[PDB]
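User: Can you write out an input/output pair for a complex, sequences first and structure second?

Assistant: Here is one pair. Inputs:
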Amino acid sequence: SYCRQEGKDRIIFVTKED
Amino acid sequence: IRAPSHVPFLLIGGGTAAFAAARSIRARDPGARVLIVSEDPELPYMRPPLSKELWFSDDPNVTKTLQFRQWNGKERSIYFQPPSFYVSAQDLPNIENGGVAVLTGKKVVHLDVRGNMVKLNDGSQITFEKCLIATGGTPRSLSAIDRAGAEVKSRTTLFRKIGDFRALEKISREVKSITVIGGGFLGSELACALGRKSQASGIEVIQLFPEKGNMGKILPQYLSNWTMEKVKREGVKVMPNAIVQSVGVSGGRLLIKLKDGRKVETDHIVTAVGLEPNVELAKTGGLEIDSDFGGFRVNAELQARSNIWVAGDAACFYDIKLGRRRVEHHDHAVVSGRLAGENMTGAAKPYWHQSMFWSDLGPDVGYEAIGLVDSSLPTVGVFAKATEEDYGKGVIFYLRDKVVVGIVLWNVFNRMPIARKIIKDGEQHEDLNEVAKLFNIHEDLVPRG
Ligand SMILES: Cc1cc2nc3c(=O)[nH]c(=O)nc-3n(C[C@H](O)[C@H](O)[C@H](O)COP(=O)(O)OP(=O)(O)OC[C@H]3O[C@@H](n4cnc5c(N)ncnc54)[C@H](O)[C@@H]3O)c2cc1C
Ligand SMILES: NC(=O)c1ccc[n+]([C@@H]2O[C@H](COP(=O)([O-])OP(=O)(O)OC[C@H]3O[C@@H](n4cnc5c(N)ncnc54)[C@H](O)[C@@H]3O)[C@@H](O)[C@H]2O)c1
């Protein structure tokens, strides 16, 4: 769930596991 | 051949928009009589292949056959239909069950709105019951190129038409270095097309543009940067943050001096710096132009005046959900053309069905996209992580008032319906990570294009 906010653009990584 | 004095359906501008319209007209009202007047001498053909599919054709006769093999392996032509499936301008107002006639090599130069008539470049006038403007647009020229002398001007091409491709395909086998200016859809697609050709020819491929990364008008910086780096891999010298100052001819070769001071020596230049709509007839007819967006100002049903519609790239319509906009893609030209044709035959149904676009920059980059895709908005990219950052695959949401207005399916294929729903819905979703799970990102999915 690596969530990081870069200005107006927000970046969420997820690994499939739900 | 002589033009028919009158025709019920006149489509100014024989491009991708005109064709859909005529097809949709013929469909909704059978036995229609449709005349496409086209300043281009080529019959209506599709443009996407000219930056992508025709550069990768193995057959060296591609420049003559203008065929390609679809991502499904089936071989076709860029022309929408063969000549035999068009009727003649002469025989159109007689032939039984009408048909579609294309007037090649004829520009409309005046639109007599009041009297429902067009005047052609050759004087000949044609009256109409219903008329569609589908003039599309012309590619913008770089200011610096214009200012330079005709020596450098002669060694600079723009890209749109068939000949543009056919000539730049030759120039690709002649010069040692080609520099593409502009980081656009086209910019990138040509840079990657030449890049792949350079794998065999060894030619220098340079691409420079003022943004910090490729496709910087529709991609968020991170992805923009990542995409630049994937273009690089395909065989491109990419020079972001390039503001051209002047282009002269030094040593028999074009010299591009940038404002930041860098110089670039190259043999040929191709400017892909955006598109200007062909809104010529606006003044002649007294039709309105979108001051902000450009192109003819048409309502929700792509209608301008009582008997005049506009579609394709030339049209600035009112999207009842996303707001007023003008969109310059291929599916847009088709969708809107379809609709205009419906409304011309009297459907008066508004633009509800969304149009989309796709670009493929090498095998690593392929994205379908819908609605308001504009790097200036706030984005929320959700990407797949492994099991030194990999934006290989994921979905990117575009927000406006905490509402999704545009989506980019990043190497996620055959998922456009799902996205389409999300735009329709325009919910204020608390967490978009759930919404992302709907695209089964991690899953392999299908690898179209
Ligand atoms: C190389 C290339 C690749 C592309 N690839 C993609 C892609 O992969 N995906 C995507 O979504 N979009 C793509 N596009 C964009 C898309 O193809 C265009 O938006 C589309 O072709 C425009 O259709 P249109 O009919 O509105 O305009 P055009 O296709 O430009 O048709 C306009 C026609 O009208 C003629 N005309 C203009 N003014 C007059 C006049 N006064 N009288 C008579 N005739 C006139 C023009 O000469 C031309 O024949 C691509 C475009 C290019 C150039
Ligand atoms: N995949 C697709 O949907 C696709 C593919 C090819 C072409 N197209 C269409 O073809 C047409 C041509 O697109 P395009 O790439 O020419 O423009 P574009 O609108 O796609 O991109 C505009 C670009 O102009 C560049 N630019 C503007 N001013 C500049 C300047 N002074 N110096 C340098 N660069 C400058 C910027 O880098 C920017 O990226 C458009 O209608 C586009 O939508 C679409």
